[PDB]
Amino acid sequence: MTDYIKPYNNDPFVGHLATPINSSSLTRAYLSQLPIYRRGVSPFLRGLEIGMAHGYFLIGPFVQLGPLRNTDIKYLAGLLSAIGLIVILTLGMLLYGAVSFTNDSQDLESVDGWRQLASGFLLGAVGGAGFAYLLLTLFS
Amino acid sequence: VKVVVDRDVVPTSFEKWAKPGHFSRSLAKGPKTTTWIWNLHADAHDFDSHTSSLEEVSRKIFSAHFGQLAIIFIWLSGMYFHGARFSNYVAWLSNPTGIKPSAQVVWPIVGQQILNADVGGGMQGIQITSGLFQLWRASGIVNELQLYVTALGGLGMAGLMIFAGWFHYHKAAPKLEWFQNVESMLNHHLAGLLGLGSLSWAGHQIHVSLPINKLLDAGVAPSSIPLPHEFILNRNLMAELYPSFQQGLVPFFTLNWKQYSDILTFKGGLSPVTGGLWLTDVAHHHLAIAVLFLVAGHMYRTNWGIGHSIKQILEAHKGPLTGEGHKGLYEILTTSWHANLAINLAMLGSLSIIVAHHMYAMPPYPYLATDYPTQLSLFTHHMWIGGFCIVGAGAHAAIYMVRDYSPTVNFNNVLDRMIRHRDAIISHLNWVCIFLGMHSFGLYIHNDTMRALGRAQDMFSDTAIQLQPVFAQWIQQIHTLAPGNTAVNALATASYAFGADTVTVGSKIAMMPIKLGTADFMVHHIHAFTIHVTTLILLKGVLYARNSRLIPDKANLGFRFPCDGPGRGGTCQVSAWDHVFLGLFWMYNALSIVIFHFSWKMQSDVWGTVTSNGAISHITGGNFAQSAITINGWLRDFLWAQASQVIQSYGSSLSAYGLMFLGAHFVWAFSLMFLFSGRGYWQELIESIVWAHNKLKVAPAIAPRALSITQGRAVGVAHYLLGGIATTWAFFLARIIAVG
Amino acid sequence: MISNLVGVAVGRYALGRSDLTQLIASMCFGHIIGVGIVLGLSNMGVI
Amino acid sequence: EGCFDPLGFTEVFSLEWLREAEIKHCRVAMLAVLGVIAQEFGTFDFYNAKSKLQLSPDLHNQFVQNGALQQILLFVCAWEFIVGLPALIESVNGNREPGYFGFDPLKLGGTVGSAQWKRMQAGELRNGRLAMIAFGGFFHQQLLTKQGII
Amino acid sequence: TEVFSLEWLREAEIKHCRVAMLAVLGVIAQEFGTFDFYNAKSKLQLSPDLHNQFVQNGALQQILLFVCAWEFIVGLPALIESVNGNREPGYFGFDPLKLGGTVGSAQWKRMQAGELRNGRLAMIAFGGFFHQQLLTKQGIIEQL
Numbered sequence A: 001m002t003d004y005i006k007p008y009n010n011d012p013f014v015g016h017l018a019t020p021i022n023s024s025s026l027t028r029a030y031l032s033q034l035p036i037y038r039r040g041v042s043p044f045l046r047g048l049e050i051g052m053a054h055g056y057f058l059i060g061p062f063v064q065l066g067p068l069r070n071t072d073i074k075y076l077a078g079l080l081s082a083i084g085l086i087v088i089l090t091l092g093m094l095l096y097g098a099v100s101f102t103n104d105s106q107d108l109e110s111v112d113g114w115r116q117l118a119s120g121f122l123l124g125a126v127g128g129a130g131f132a133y134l135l136l137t138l139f140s
Numbered sequence B: 001v002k003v004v005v006d007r008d009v010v011p012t013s014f015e016k017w018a019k020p021g022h023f024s025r026s027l028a029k030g031p032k033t034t035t036w037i038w039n040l041h042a043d044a045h046d047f048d049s050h051t052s053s054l055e056e057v058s059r060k061i062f063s064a065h066f067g068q069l070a071i072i073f074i075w076l077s078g079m080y081f082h083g084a085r086f087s088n089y090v091a092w093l094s095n096p097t098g099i100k101p102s103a104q105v106v107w108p109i110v111g112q113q114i115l116n117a118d119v120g121g122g123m124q125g126i127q128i129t130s131g132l133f134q135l136w137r138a139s140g141i142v143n144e145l146q147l148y149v150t151a152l153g154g155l156g157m158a159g160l161m162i163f164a165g166w167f168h169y170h171k172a173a174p175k176l177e178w179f180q181n182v183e184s185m186l187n188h189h190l191a192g193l194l195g196l197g198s199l200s201w202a203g204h205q206i207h208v209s210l211p212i213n214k215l216l217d218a219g220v221a222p223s224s225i226p227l228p229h230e231f232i233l234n235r236n237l238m239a240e241l242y243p244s245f246q247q248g249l250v251p252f253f254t255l256n257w258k259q260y261s262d263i264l265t266f267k268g269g270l271s272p273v274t275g276g277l278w279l280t281d282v283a284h285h286h287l288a289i290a291v292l293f294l295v296a297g298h299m300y301r302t303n304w305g306i307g308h309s310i311k312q313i314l315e316a317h318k319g320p321l322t323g324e325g326h327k328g329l330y331e332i333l334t335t336s337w338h339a340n341l342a343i344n345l346a347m348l349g350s351l352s353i354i355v356a357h358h359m360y361a362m363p364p365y366p367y368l369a370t371d372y373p374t375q376l377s378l379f380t381h382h383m384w385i386g387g388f389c390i391v392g393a394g395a396h397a398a399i400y401m402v403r404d405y406s407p408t409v410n411f412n413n414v415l416d417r418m419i420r421h422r423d424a425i426i427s428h429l430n431w432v433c434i435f436l437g438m439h440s441f442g443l444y445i446h447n448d449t450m451r452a453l454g455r456a457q458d459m460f461s462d463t464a465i466q467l468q469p470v471f472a473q474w475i476q477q478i479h480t481l482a483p484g485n486t487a488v489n490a491l492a493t494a495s496y497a498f499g500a501d502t503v504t505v506g507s508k509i510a511m512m513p514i515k516l517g518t519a520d521f522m523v524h525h526i527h528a529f530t531i532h533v534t535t536l537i538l539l540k541g542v543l544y545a546r547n548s549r550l551i552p553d554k555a556n557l558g559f560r561f562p563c564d565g566p567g568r569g570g571t572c573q574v575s576a577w578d579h580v581f582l583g584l585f586w587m588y589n590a591l592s593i594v595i596f597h598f599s600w601k602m603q604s605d606v607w608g609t610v611t612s613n614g615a616i617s618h619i620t621g622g623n624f625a626q627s628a629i630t631i632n633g634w635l636r637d638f639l640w641a642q643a644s645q646v647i648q649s650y651g652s653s654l655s656a657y658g659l660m661f662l663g664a665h666f667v668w669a670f671s672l673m674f675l676f677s678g679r680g681y682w683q684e685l686i687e688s689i690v691w692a693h694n695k696l697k698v699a700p701a702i703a704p705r706a707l708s709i710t711q712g713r714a715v716g717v718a719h720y721l722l723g724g725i726a727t728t729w730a731f732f733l734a735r736i737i738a739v740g
Numbered sequence C: 001m002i003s004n005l006v007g008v009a010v011g012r013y014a015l016g017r018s019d020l021t022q023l024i025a026s027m028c029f030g031h032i033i034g035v036g037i038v039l040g041l042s043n044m045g046v047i
Numbered sequence D: 001e002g003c004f005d006p007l008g009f010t011e012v013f014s015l016e017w018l019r020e021a022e023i024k025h026c027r028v029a030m031l032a033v034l035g036v037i038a039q040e041f042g043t044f045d046f047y048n049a050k051s052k053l054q055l056s057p058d059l060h061n062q063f064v065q066n067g068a069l070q071q072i073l074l075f076v077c078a079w080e081f082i083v084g085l086p087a088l089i090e091s092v093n094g095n096r097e098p099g100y101f102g103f104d105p106l107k108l109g110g111t112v113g114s115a116q117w118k119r120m121q122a123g124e125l126r127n128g129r130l131a132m133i134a135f136g137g138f139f140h141q142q143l144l145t146k147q148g149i150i
Numbered sequence E: 001t002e003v004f005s006l007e008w009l010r011e012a013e014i015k016h017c018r019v020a021m022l023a024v025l026g027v028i029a030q031e032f033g034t035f036d037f038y039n040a041k042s043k044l045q046l047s048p049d050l051h052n053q054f055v056q057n058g059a060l061q062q063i064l065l066f067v068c069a070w071e072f073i074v075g076l077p078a079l080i081e082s083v084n085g086n087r088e089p090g091y092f093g094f095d096p097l098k099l100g101g102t103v104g105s106a107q108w109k110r111m112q113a114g115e116l117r118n119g120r121l122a123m124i125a126f127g128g129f130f131h132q133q134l135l136t137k138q139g140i141i142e143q144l
């Protein structure tokens, strides 16, 4: 018994190696459950949900606050700016795999699986901008 | 707790004064360099850079305490003198409105007599904004004789402190054991100083209030004012002015406290006669604070065995995220004279700011709210004082990790964690600063773009309704309904800045329900931006002062060092004292924006005039309902319209505030000489002048050298602040006199 | 009156437990409990 | 002299250099009963009468003729004795004073000699301690209505 | 407790005790013929408030403050060391000091004979002598 087990194991058994607010022991498992870095899957699916999450809310800001927000046409300004930025952002994200070229044997996190998740990101972003598009139409 | 005195340690001799630099053998044998001339004064107050014997360091700082204390007493004893020899306080005592304040006269030498401002009362001079007349009126002082007696009584107390700081030293000297009695120290500071101080002044404004309250507020001449001793020598006079004095400390023992309700009340708000807070509420206030401090002054171990102690109090506080928490903090504060100074400078610095806010919010002195120059000056005065003090708190909280922190002696796992996950603290504050910057000032860029672009500012009006009157509006409404409901014993709010539509006017507006709007959310977040950046850089200098990732051997170099060299791409300005040097600058920007906000928003919506045909007409009538949202309005309607009151004064008596205004930019831009150039070029610049000095041998024995790398930056911030305060000092004292 | 003096006396005698047995501290704190309850009583004001 | 287990200390000072009040507390009471005998002594212009004495007939005018020096000198008299009590021994005491600790040693005195004493010494402050209960025992009634003779 | 500080303290006591005695023997001497006699009409014209701000005496006080300066600028160095200034009064006093010591056995320390008592009596008595006659207009309470 040296120092009586590290002053109470640094208070009631902390541990938590990959936890300190980066992702709790529940949240790190929630990240493994989270599709952006999902286990047991490859081509398209690691992405796809990425776009279905990003493009889904990209309609949000420019509908109420964008440079166009005072007439009836303004329901479209939230989507045109979003889709234009979606094309720009898709190019910017796809270019990362072109910059990387060291792990050509590790095709998942480098080039192959990288493009095989951004491919789902393109349809996810555009489609997700179209998914939240038809959600506020029946109430208007 | 024991009388341990080391009588006679240092003799009384002029021998040390004969040697320039006796405090250090390194600053005595080699005065062959110009740099030594500046090192003699730079280290003159760095007492921990001489001897390490704490029994002598404690016997060199308590000496400086009594020395500074004597300087302050010499300073205060003159204020009562200037308000008697040449002033207008008695005439202002009879006529307070038409007679402007003044307590400084000039002489006919070079035509400077134009500064004699026509204030009235048969005396000309220079207007004052120190609040001396309000304090003296709130003290019951009427005759000039009461000024001279207080001044002559101040000379005695000023001399006794010099003969005290020269007593416990060249004559006496307590041991080192007398300083670890921090337990016995807080029992005499919270009870002897705070306690008896809040009680002694409380017992004064109970018997001196009626020469101000039940006399000077009725309409009696200053000659008809009775004497303060005539009220005490005859208890029935106090009994008639207050029908509670007939008892004379009889229900005080009977616990029939309600019979003392003629002086002890809790009204709230302001008085519609004087112009400030109630003269009876402050007496009861200080009585309430005095008893609380008489209780709070008994908390630590003396020599009877009862009570807590800073030791086991901190040895008991734990916490999950803290680990070995709070323990060792006793050894932190009881060993380093420095260590107490940062927590003092931090608390007292924020205290000066908080009391500055409490000044304008609820004016405690009579005839203070209407006196706009004094009010505006005093707020920003304590504002900048606390700015310097909090940065000094960072300046020394950076000293601690370098000068008095050890990995074996003093230990708190809390402070350990502040240095173990140290890269996380500043990372959080960094992202917070950037989020509060790219938006608060980003929205400034946004709105200034919307106006020059066209119809975008028009569609911003709905967003101008947002944020503003959305938050903090309900807080004011809570305070509107706080009396009666959550304050049954209060017939008024905390201040009339809370009570809506309730305006108190004494020919000039005293307070207003400060209706937030338009851009208060903007400037408050400019504040929070400049506050988080200031806290970031200073806290960075605090916890990165010991362990640094770039250079691991950081403790060897020091605190006020230049850098390391051109290696590692470039190690430049990495000292914690430089985080304070730049910390002074972000504090400078913070306090500058806060004084701008306070000052201008006042006359925008608060300060104004009143007529019977209408209601309220401000000096500048509701301008920052739009001119605050953009950066342009801060120099289109703010920094531009102010030149009509600072420059258009040469034909009057306000010409000095224009000369100091235009001359403060000189010394500020003079700081741009040191904050931009380097010692290398300037050192190549001397040797040419020294060549001309070697041509005629007129070269001094003291070899001409450039300023130190650190001393140049210390002088640079000195001028950036002096030249960066005297301009707004001349500006705050420019318009407020013309529009007073 | 007598009820108030005995009120202070009972407020100082209700302070005689284990944590109060230390002489002068039990008396001073007694007034804190005594006068305080009286100030809480205050000729029965309450609400 | 009857007690058992409880904690409680009669007299005693932790630093035990408290002679400023303790030494004079039986002497301060000597000038207290002086007021009990009081200023009237028989015939001539009597100084004061009845229970009122102290403050009802305290003279209408009294900040000077009630001597400031009279109060001042008390402090001055105290300074001779009371100030000089931490240590502050003076050279005047004694003959052949050099090396005073060596000459005529004192010591504890519990041994054989000086048996059965200091009872007398301790006797006075017993009355002083008696007095504090007894003094204020008459003082509580002074606040009240004080009908007639009281 | 220290040497050089108590030096100026005991000196200032001596340097003013003679001043606090020649002034008493000067203020009493100038008012010996007008002490009583109907209380000199409340000090008569000797009341300081009645004086015309010392019109004729101001230029005289300046001359006095000048000469008195060098008088004390002789007292400052004459105290320094024993020789010259203090040494000649030194052996002068030693002539009565020898007889006084003979009357007082081994030495009879003269400072205990009356250097401190006279020095402090003059100061305290002159401090009270300046308040009873010059620092009270309305008595209110009878002064005894």
Ligand SMILES: CC1=C(C/C=C(\C)CCC[C@H](C)CCC[C@H](C)CCCC(C)C)C(=O)c2ccccc2C1=O
Pocket: B673, B674, B675, B677, B678, B679, B682, B705, B706, B707, B708, B709, B712
């Ligand atoms: C000018 C300058 C210097 C040189 C600074 C000097 C030489 C300071 C000069 C100040 C003194 C006080 C001026 C000389 C006056 C003498 C003291 C003589 C005075 C005698 C009577 C007037 C009292 C630097 O060392 C430096 C270093 C790093 C960046 C920039 C700079 C920089 O700009």
